[PDB]
Amino acid sequence: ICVNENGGCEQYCSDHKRSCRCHEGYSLLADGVSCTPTVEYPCGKIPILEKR
Amino acid sequence: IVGGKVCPKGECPWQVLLLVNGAQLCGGTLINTIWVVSAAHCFDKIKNWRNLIAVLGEHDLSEHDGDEQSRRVAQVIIPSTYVPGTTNHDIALLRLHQPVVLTDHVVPLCLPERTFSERTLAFVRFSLVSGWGQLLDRGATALELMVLNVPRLMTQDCLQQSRSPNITEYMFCAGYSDGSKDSCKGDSGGPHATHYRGTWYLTGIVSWGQGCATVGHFGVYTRVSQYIEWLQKLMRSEPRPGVLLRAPFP
Ligand SMILES: COc1cc([C@@H](Nc2ccc(C(=N)N)cc2)C(=O)N[C@H](C(=O)O)c2ccccc2)ccc1OCc1ccccc1
Ligand SMILES: [Ca+2]
* B169 within some domain: yes
Q: How far is CA B195 from the centre of its chain?
A: 16
- List A18's β-bridge partners, or say none: A15
> Within a 10 A sphere around the Cβ of B16, how many other Cβ atoms?
28
Of B142, B118, B242, B121, which is closest to residue B190 (Cα–Cα)? B142
Is residue B156, in this structure, part of any structural domain at all?
A: yes
Whether B212 lines ligand 1, by a CB cut-off of 6 Å, is yes
Residue whose Cα lies nearest atom 37 of ligand 1: it is B210
In a shared domain, residues B54 and B130:
no
CATH of the domain at B217: 2.40.10.10
Cβ contact B110–A23 (<8 Å): yes
Residue B144 lies in a domain: yes
How far, in Å, CA of B229 to CA of B212, rounded? 31
**Min Cα–Cα distance to chain A from B86, Å:** 31
Same-domain check for residues B116 and B25: no
Q: Which domains, from first to last, does chain A contain? A: 1-52 (2.10.25.10)
Number of structural domains (chain B) is 2
Is B25 inside any structural domain? Answer: yes
Domain with B168 in it: 1-12+109-225
DSSP for B30-64 reads E-SSSEEEE-GGGGTT-S-GGGEEEEES--BTT--
CB neighbours of residue B177 within 10 Å: 18
Q: Name the active-site residue from B38, B59, B89, B90.
A: B90
Residue B88: what residue type? N
Is B178 an active-site residue? no
- Please check whether residue B94 is in contact with residue B36, taking contact to mean a CB–CB distance below 8 angstroms: yes
Q: Is B237 a catalytic residue?
A: no
How far apart CA B156 and CA B154 sit, in angstroms, is 6
Domain assignment present for residue B246? The answer is: no
For every residue of B196-229, DSSP letters joined together read ETTEEEEEEEEEE-SSSS-TT--EEEEEGGGGHH
What are the distances in angstroms from CA B63 to CA A20, B90, B102, B180? 44, 31, 21, 29
Q: Which helix (H) or strand (E) holds A18?
A: strand A18-21
